[PDB]
Design a protein around this ligand. Structure first.
Ligand SMILES: [Zn+2]
Ligand SMILES: [Zn+2]
Length: 363
């Protein structure tokens, strides 16, 4: 029979029955499952330092953002984008393709087709659950202990005064694997006093760090998470690797580039492109490997499309159509925010709406 996996170290966010205000630091803010008091109650240490108990039965206060730090895996599978094998964490199987799967990073990282509906397979024992397309679903940004975060020592600290002392600060440079069997479970810190090291952020449910300034950890499809209880690359890795022959090559530190937008910090002598990512990493590519787009900027004034057929198509295709939007057609408005799924929050007619970026034009 199916049973709950009491996965200590799972990275979680607030769930559908959440009623505890801003205890997590806000929606999309991340925490670590420290332990289970029972099969109904779980202890979470949020990245902001707050420890609290939550319901994981009948009522569900939490969603799983990443279970990979627990080591749970799906032997006999491979992620067809990044080639992780076995898939560690939640398994995401494309329902519309033959024998195609993604890991959680590639799934939330918008790899494969966003209009193809996936199955969520949370555990090896889970029945597969058909989801809505990512293209039509709400995407938010994770916040907490991620690259760029400003941190102090956390509750489970046992590393002497490596930080220079309790309350001394440092910056997370990179989320790493504490061990091969527990990915995404550690954070490398550069302490302000020049010291540096790797600390547990999820490994064995440990919280060595607490951010005083949380950072963005990339975006995810919130309602696709199971309840508990510049330039981008859109080309298949085998392509990338052989294209990289004589243009910087490939190393296993570059997988960030497959799902994370990087910025062109330069152009070298062999006409290859140097690219910097929020990790702090620089990487060099054959220009073929890279593709650029995302047009608009915050504060841009734009005109809403005035072809109703087209704007209906555009809004529906992106899961954001409402008849109430009719008075915005042809109106000029201001880009308030560029969402992670490329849609736009636009101030128009004294309200805000979410628009497909093709549904507006720079004025
Ligand atoms: Zn993957
Ligand atoms: Zn597919």
């Amino acid at each position: 029979s199916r049973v709950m996996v009491e996965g200590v170290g799972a990275r979680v966010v607030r769930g559908p029955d959440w009623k505890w205000g801003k205890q997590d630091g806000g929606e999309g803010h991340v925490g670590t499952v420290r332990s289970f008091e029972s099969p109904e109650e779980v202890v979470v240490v949020w990245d902001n330092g707050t420890a609290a108990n939550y319901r994981c039965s009948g009522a569900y206060d939490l969603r799983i953002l990443d279970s990979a730090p627990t080591g749970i895996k799906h032997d006999g599978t491979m992620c067809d984008t990044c080639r992780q094998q076995p898939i560690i964490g939640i398994r995401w199987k494309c329902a519309e393709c033959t024998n195609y799967d993604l890991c959680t990073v590639c799934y939330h990282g918008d790899k494969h087709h966003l209009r193809h509906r996936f199955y969520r397979i949370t555990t090896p024992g889970s029945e597969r659950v058909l989801l809505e397309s990512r293209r039509k679903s709400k995407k938010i940004t994770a916040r907490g202990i991620f690259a760029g975060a400003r941190v102090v020592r956390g509750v489970d600290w046992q590393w002497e005064d490596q930080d220079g002392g309790n309350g001394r600060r440092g910056k997370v440079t990179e989320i790493q694997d504490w061990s091969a069997s527990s990915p995404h479970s550690a954070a490398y810190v550069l302490w302000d006093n020049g010291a540096k090291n790797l600390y547990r952020v999820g490994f064995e449910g440990m919280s060595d760090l607490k951010c005083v300034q949380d950072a963005k950890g990339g975006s995810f499809y919130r309602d696709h998470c199971p309840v508990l209880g510049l330039v981008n690359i859109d080309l298949d890795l085998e392509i990338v690797q052989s294209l990289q022959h004589g243009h910087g090559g490939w190393t296993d530190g570059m997988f960030e580039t497959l799902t994370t937008t990087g910025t062109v910090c330069g152009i070298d002598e062999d006409h290859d492109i140097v690219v910097q990512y929020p990790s702090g990493n620089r990487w060099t590519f054959n220009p073929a490997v890279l593709t650029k787009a995302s047009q608009f900027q915050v504060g841009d004034l734009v005109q809403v499309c005035y072809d109703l057929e087209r704007i209906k198509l555009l809004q529906r295709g992106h899961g954001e159509w409402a008849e109430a939007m009719l008075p915005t057609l042809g109106k000029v408005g201001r880009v308030q925010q560029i969402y992670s799924d490329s849609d736009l929050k636009v101030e128009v007619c004294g309200t805000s709406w979410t628009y497909n970026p093709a549904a507006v034009s720079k004025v």
